[PDB]
Ligand binder design. Structure first.
Ligand SMILES: C[C@@H](c1cccc2c(-c3ccc(NS(C)(=O)=O)c(F)c3)c(C(=O)O)[nH]c12)N1CC(CN2CC(N)C2)OC1=O
Ligand SMILES: [Zn+2]
Ligand SMILES: [Zn+2]
Length: 232
C-alpha cells in the first residue's frame, strides 16, 4: 500500500513495481538461493514510448512475471535491457527477455563471466566501460564502471533527468549489517570504487541498492563502512 515492498511481503514468483521518480521505477522480486529467500531490485526507465530495463527479476519465471507486471502497470514495451553484473539476480531471465523481443546488453566482462559460470548471457556487448571511471550513454541513462566492488564487472546506472543513482549490488541498503554475498567481491577495492561513485554523482537524490530499500547518498558511505568492517 505505498511502502517499499520487502522480502516477506513478496512471494517468490511475484513482482512489484515502485515509482521512484517521473519515468523511473524499481522492480522488486524474491528468490530462493541456498535455502534462504532474498529480495532483489532492478530498474525501469521510460525511454519515450518505450522502456529500458536494468537487470532481470532473478530467474526465468520471475522475469516473465516482471514483464506482465510492466504491461499491467505501465503498458509500454520493454525494448532493451542492461544487466549490471554476471550473477543470476542480474542475468537470470535474459533468455525470457530475449524471447519477448527485448535486446539484452552487458559489458564484455559481464558476458565472459556469465558464460564461464553457466549463467544466461546477454546478447550485445557494451564497449567503452572497461576502465574504472568510464561512462557511456544508453538511452535515458548513463552507465558507469566504478571499479571492482561486489564483483569485478559491476556497473552502476544514473538517470540524469531524475538524479537517480542505481547502485546495483555495489551499494547496500542502510539496514545492512554485513556486505551481502561477497563470494566474487574485491573487499579491498570496494571502498575506492564507492568513492568514485560519490565523486562522479554528487547530485544524486535517490540511491537504489541491488537488494533492499532505497535512500539517499548515505547508502554510499554506509556501504563503504560495512565492507571495511567485513574485511576487518
Ligand atoms: C545470486 C547472488 C546472490 C545469492 C544469494 C544472496 C545474495 C546477496 C545478498 C545476501 C545478503 C544481503 N543482505 S546484507 C547486505 O548481508 O545485509 C544482500 F543485500 C544480498 C547478494 C548481494 O549481496 O548482491 N547476492 C546474492 N550471488 C551468487 C554468488 C556466488 N555464487 C557462487 C558462484 N560464484 C555464484 O554471489 C552472489 O552475489
Ligand atoms: Zn552479485
Ligand atoms: Zn546482488
Amino acid at each position: 500500500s505505498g511502502e517499499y515492498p520487502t522480502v516477506n511481503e513478496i512471494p517468490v514468483g511475484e513482482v512489484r513495481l515502485y515509482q521512484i521518480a517521473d519515468g523511473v521505477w524499481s522492480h522488486i522480486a524474491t528468490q530462493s538461493f541456498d535455502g534462504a529467500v532474498y529480495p532483489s531490485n532492478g530498474l525501469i526507465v521510460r525511454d519515450g514510448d518505450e522502456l529500458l530495463l536494468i537487470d532481470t527479476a532473478w530467474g526465468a519465471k520471475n522475469t516473465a512475471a516482471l514483464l506482465a507486471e510492466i504491461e499491467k502497470q505501465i503498458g509500454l514495451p520493454v525494448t532493451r535491457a542492461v544487466s549490471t553484473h554476471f550473477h543470476d539476480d542480474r542475468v537470470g531471465g535474459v533468455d525470457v527477455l530475449r524471447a519477448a523481443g527485448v535486446a539484452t546488453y552487458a559489458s564484455p566482462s559481464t558476458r565472459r563471466l556469465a558464460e564461464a559460470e553457466g549463467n544466461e548471457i546477454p546478447t550485445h556487448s557494451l564497449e567503452g566501460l572497461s576502465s574504472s571511471g568510464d561512462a557511456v550513454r544508453f538511452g535515458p541513462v548513463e552507465l558507469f564502471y566504478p571499479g571492482a566492488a561486489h564483483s569485478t564487472d559491476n556497473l552502476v546506472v544514473y538517470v540524469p533527468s531524475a538524479n537517480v543513482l542505481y547502485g546495483g549490488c555495489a551499494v547496500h541498503e542502510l539496514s545492512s549489517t554485513s556486505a551481502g554475498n561477497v563470494a566474487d567481491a574485491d573487499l579491498a577495492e570496494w571502498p575506492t570504487s564507492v568513492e568514485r561513485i560519490q565523486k562522479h554523482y554528487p547530485e544524486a537524490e535517490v540511491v537504489i541498492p541491488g537488494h533492499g530499500l532505497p535512500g539517499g547518498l548515505d547508502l554510499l558511505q554506509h556501504t563503504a563502512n560495512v565492507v571495511k568492517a567485513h574485511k576487518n
